[PDB]
Amino acid sequence: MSLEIPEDKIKEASIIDIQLKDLKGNTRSLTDLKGKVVLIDFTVYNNAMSAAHNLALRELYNKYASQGFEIYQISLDGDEHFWKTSADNLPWVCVRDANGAYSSYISLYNVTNLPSVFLVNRNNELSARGENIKDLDEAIKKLLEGHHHHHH
Hints:
By secondary structure, this protein is of the alpha/beta class. It has helices at residues 48-64, 80-87, 104-109, 136-144; strands at residues 20-21, 27-28, 37-43, 69-75, 93-96, 116-121, 125-129.
């Protein structure tokens, strides 16, 4: 949607609205996917490591997607060939970065390593980094658990 800096608690500008377009050309933003809890995936549609990583995502999807979960997957590879062919048959959101590994977003997070994952709950709140989340299963669960008069 747009990059604005909100504040009140915790930290200001705590959520990055990632605007990149998907396989069909639809420019996706995290403010768009706010209807669900957003899984921020940073990987390369190219690498064998993406295959096994995608399975972990596939699991998490079969788990919580039915309750309001979505995977926003960003391709940092730069190859529309493997991206387009693979993503065409993919369930969740598949978009591409402008520079991939040299992403401005990657620079903004100070993620550095890659590939990586990051968490976002329903309100498009940045939950935590993948390096911090050794429990994405429970993480996405507790994000959804805000429904029981709480934030989890």
